Write a protein that binds this ligand. Structure first.
Ligand code: JH1
Ligand code: JH1
Ligand code: ZN
Ligand code: ZN
Ligand code: ZN
Ligand code: ZN
Lengths: 360, 360
């Protein structure tokens, strides 16, 4: 059976399970069950399922080299699908809540969930809570007797936490750290001293890389009972590297990809985000360019945003991007080679993850 | 050592642990660690700690009748405190998010967290996420080798989920169920058909009782390795009963307790909440009273709210409250007696929980 059709069938099975359990154990009525079904579909479906399919892909790689009964192969693949859906649902939780937090308008060419007329922020915040709770309901139901349950829950938990910490790093990235204070409304930075590569790296490493690359890889390993076939420090290093490159690409697209292709109108400039573009621009600009950057960044005024975009163009950031890209290719290939020592199979799965990221 | 001082010392220990772990493993800087410390204090401290002290109280009861080494007694009490703080932190998560969801202004005579000038909704939503993540970080750190870890995590998980489901029941309680639809903005009910005792019961049972009474009781049992000393169906029944009475009292106070004593200006009437008052009023009103209720309920206009309050006064709901109260005393005393068969000690802890609720 092809991997994606297996993955999507398991969504239907997991959906039915969660809703059936709401009716039998949580006293839900048909109308609220229908709302939750619609919310699940709208928030969990319609992306590429890269995260969840990674779990499946890693597991398939091991199946090709490991002896098992057919019923075991099916059980491992089912497990990988369930684990993949845990990660998709975790992502859906963070996208719902992040869209609310950020006042976002669109996501994948449709309105953000909270903006649906029959939702509202009041419900949406809670809907995003439920999305994450479902991850745990899935785990406890499908993996109850599994030897990996402990390690899976502990990992999931650490990744979730890392993500929320990353969210904090991101939403506070345009404030001066020394002025953070719950009692005092936060001014935007005037000096931009904290727009550095290392500070940027910390934002991206926590906010995206742990749940986008680390978790799918290591979950694939746990449902395969294969974690002792890898050097876990390598898996972390390669995850964080590829995840960083992914976020840089996202940052560049926010500014330069036409909205109809982006699925939204990008506002990182108006939001004064610590983006790869802003940090790389500041690492090469002259005094007058920095000054003009500071006069225009982090302002809704479209004239000011057009000025920032122009500054980035004239600064030939495309060439810094190619140079970053080249270095990432070196490092990711080096880590892939190192992973071949203990597992050629796992190494190949990381190669596939890298190709899918590097091309898109 | 007195229970409350033990409980509060453990807050300091758990705080230090979480922040120290942010620095050593999550790359946090001192300023963000200070924000998170302030957020933790502001959202977790300053209530009565009834929930968390219940875990401690149940555990102390068992210690008085069970043979242990002194180091075991200390370890059990430490565990009960940690488990109590998990529940306080879970509550803090739900109060942060609920205040945002509801546009609340105050909580315990201070501004809601999101309203602090240096917070904002953008941060606060995520801060509430972090509050719940800390529950799991505590559990995995302090209970890693404990035999109860599995059952504690699974229980916690089910309670959290029940709570979020309850939140949904509550925020949708003034809509007609058959019209729930994410695509269509939701009108307030005109008939109030769904303001019934059974529907009310479902709201309160999920939104409050599982995390306020069930979880503290059963966590006290799990850290005591005492769950097989009770009939778990009785513990559930008594939890849900006492929790329902707690919520009724809360509902009555929302309307009739002066704000300075309430710690907030109550808005259940303007918010069209399915309260105990609205449901009991509708179960005794005549046709003209129902009509006047419908013309005035769920409207910000202070004249209309004063009309609703007057309708409740004239309707002598205080007498229905006394009659409800009497029935709850019968039933809770009956359940307490039933709990005495397998555990007099646990029965006495439930009695204490009941007294603390019944008086306040
Ligand atoms: C051009 C060659 N090169 C650039 C770097 C670099 O570290 N850029 C800064 C940066 C920090 C964090 C990120 F996530 C992405 C990028 C390394 N080699
Ligand atoms: C007056 C004697 N009495 C009232 C009831 C009753 O069920 N009231 C409705 C109600 C439903 C749910 C709740 F949580 C609280 C209250 C039972 N005996
Ligand atoms: Zn965001
Ligand atoms: Zn972006
Ligand atoms: Zn609420
Ligand atoms: Zn209330």
């Amino acid at each position: 059976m092809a991997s994606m059709e297996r993955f999507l069938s398991v969504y239907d099975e997991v959906q039915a399970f969660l809703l059936d359990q709401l009716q039998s154990k949580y006293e839900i009525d048909p109308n609220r069950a229908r709302y939750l079904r619609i919310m699940m579909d709208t928030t969990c479906l319609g992306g590429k399922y890269f995260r969840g399919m990674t779990v499946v892909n890693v597991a398939e790689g091991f199946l090709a080299v490991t002896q098992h009964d057919e019923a075991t192969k099916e059980r491992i693949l089912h497990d990988a699908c369930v684990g993949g859906w845990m990660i998709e649902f975790l992502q859906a939780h963070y996208l719902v809540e992040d869209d609310i937090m950020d006042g976002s308008v669109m996501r994948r060419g449709k309105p953000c969930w909270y903006r649906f007329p029959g939702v509202t922020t009041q419900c949406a915040i809670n809907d995003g809570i439920i999305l994450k709770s479902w991850t745990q309901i899935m785990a406890w139901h499908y993996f109850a007797d599994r030897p990996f349950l402990k390690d899976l829950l502990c990992l999931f938990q650490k990744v979730d936490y890392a993500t929320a910490v990353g969210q904090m790093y991101d939403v506070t990235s345009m404030c001066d750290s020394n002025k953070l204070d719950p009692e005092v409304a936060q001014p935007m930075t005037t000096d931009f001293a904290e727009f550095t590569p290392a500070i940027y790296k910390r934002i991206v490493k926590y906010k995206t890389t742990f749940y986008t690359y680390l978790l799918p890889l290591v979950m694939g390993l746990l449902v395969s009972e294969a974690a002792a076939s890898v050097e876990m420090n390598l898996v972390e290093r390669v995850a964080h590297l590829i995840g960083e490159y992914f976020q840089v690409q996202d940052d560049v697209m926010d500014c330069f990809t036409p909205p109809e292709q982006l699925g939204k109108v990008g506002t990182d400039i108006e939001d004064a985000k610590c983006s790869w573009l802003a940090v790389t621009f500041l690492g090469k600009a002259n005094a007058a360019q920095v000054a003009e950057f500071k006069a225009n960044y982090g302002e809704k005024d479209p004239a000011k945003v057009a000025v920032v975009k122009r500054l980035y163009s004239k600064a030939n950031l495309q060439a810094d991007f190619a140079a970053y890209e080249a270095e990432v290719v070196r490092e990711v290939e080096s880590l892939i080679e190192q992973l071949k020592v203990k597992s050629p199979t796992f190494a190949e799965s990381v190669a596939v993850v890298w190709e899918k990221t590097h091309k898109r």
